[model samples]
Target: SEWTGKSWMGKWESTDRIENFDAFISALGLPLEQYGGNHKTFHKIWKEGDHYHHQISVPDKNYKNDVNFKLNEEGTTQHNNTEIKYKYTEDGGNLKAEVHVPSRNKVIHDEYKVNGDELEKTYKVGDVTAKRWYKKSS
Candidate 1:
């Protein structure tokens, strides 16, 4: 399906919004300077057989990271010196993930869904949430 294969990249038409989302990302150990604002954010989740990837990076930055997962299967990734675990599942055209940080007993949750002609990103951890909406080039 195009939703899973097509790449959507652009700016936040002020279209951008947030609420304590930085707190959630900081809780995950990511620096505010790197993933905080709405300047250079790239996100895409495509499929390879049953394997899926959440590719993330700024248009041109030395920093790059992705979340790897398989539907219904637990995937493991190490962040810094901590062990993290997660599972990704899809409901219709939506992709959602539940992540866990064993060391801190903290959790990270997020999802991507299609709305009209754009994609929405929602990130959550503890009681904080961050959300952004992106529109395809038109």
Candidate 2:
């Protein structure tokens, strides 16, 4: 019921904690240092016409990733030189995504749900799992 007309626009900042991140990222062969240390991270989500855009930034590492996604459409995008095929769907109050990395033989499942002013993301890849919480900016 909350799926349609759901607009998550504006900035969201990481709140309090991240769980099982080290083990989760490590399983993906990502450098430990890439996500290490104390830092502030923000994700900006917006919409433009028929597309939705997202930008994530971490000041300490000067890292940013920007992507635009079309609702309910399968699209190809590249991250770290690896091409990914992704699709988006809505389930109840959650926005669900499935990312397929053919080269790595991996599939990442993500579910983002909005709870009041907070956003909760559950990410899974194989046996690895991680959760991140974000509070919407006023």
Candidate 3:
């Protein structure tokens, strides 16, 4: 996800199924349609330790679904000190995050789920839940 104003101030991650994950996103318009035209996401799917890590940026982006940002070598435009370390369980049903927002002064837990590439997550600060459906790129 992309953050442009709050710096995330936390970490977020989750467990997801990778078997058909790519295909799932292909139907949601991820890194393509960008339903939201001003936000961006950077993630690396890697096998680490005993699970898969969906190394990513914060999802504190424009909620109006109107921003599109890029996940280049450069980090998020608004988060300078925010860092997140997360992983998805083997079952693809749970997500865990180690977030250090620098401002929160505590490592927080951020979690989510991948319902067929539809990301359902929560915001600890606002106690708000958000969902994003992704379509993989062709």
Candidate 4:
């Protein structure tokens, strides 16, 4: 374990301030009454073997979506109860992802960037973008 090529690997707990967060969830076809509609999320990222594992959990409801993939690999995963196709890519040291909802014919974009001790998770729906920041955690 040389610990090389992973400058942005660690647990991240959501912090205050999610810019225009409601619009991003609305793109997922969810209302403001649903879970994680106004909540914080915990996230994890690490490299194991050839797969980079990423996890996101809603602390209020204990809902967790866990997935892992090699860079540029396309996979299908479930978010809550909705099934969607997803792909993860690495741009420099940042993580980029795309989620395709076949049922809604929608495409959602996401990016994870590490700056200082803060990890920013940005979700995009067309020109609308929402961001949730996370702090480094043990």
In terms of lDDT, which candidate is strongest? 4
Clash count, predicted structure 4: 0
Task: Give me the runs in candidate 1 sitting further than 4 Å from their true place.
Answer: 1-19, 26-35, 59-61
- Candidates in order have lDDT scores of 0.67, 0.78, 0.35, 0.80
List, residue by residue over 16-73, the lDDT tens digit for candidate 2.
7788877777877778887643367897877777787767788777789887788788
lDDT value for model 1: 0.67
Candidates sorted on lDDT, descending: 4, 2, 1, 3
State which candidate, 1 or 3, has the greater TM-score: 1
Choose the strongest candidate by TM-score. 4
lDDT of 4 by residue, 1-138 (tens): 123366567888987867888877776677767734557778877788878777878868878888877788899888656788989888898888988988788899999898878888899978788988889875
- C-alpha lDDT of residue 116 in model 2: 71
Give stretches of model 4 more than 4 Å off.
1-4, 35-37
Which one wins by TM-score: 1 or 2? 2
Stretch of 10 with least lDDT, candidate 2 = 1-10
The stretch of ten residues in a row with the least summed lDDT in candidate 3 is 64-73
lDDT (10s digit) by residue, model 1, range 41-138: 66656666657766665654564567776789998887557888889777676777888888988888878776766778788887677777766543
Clashes of 2: 0
User: After superposing candidate 2, which stretches have Cα over 4 Å from the reference?
Assistant: 1-7, 36-38
| CA lDDT for candidate 2 | 0.78
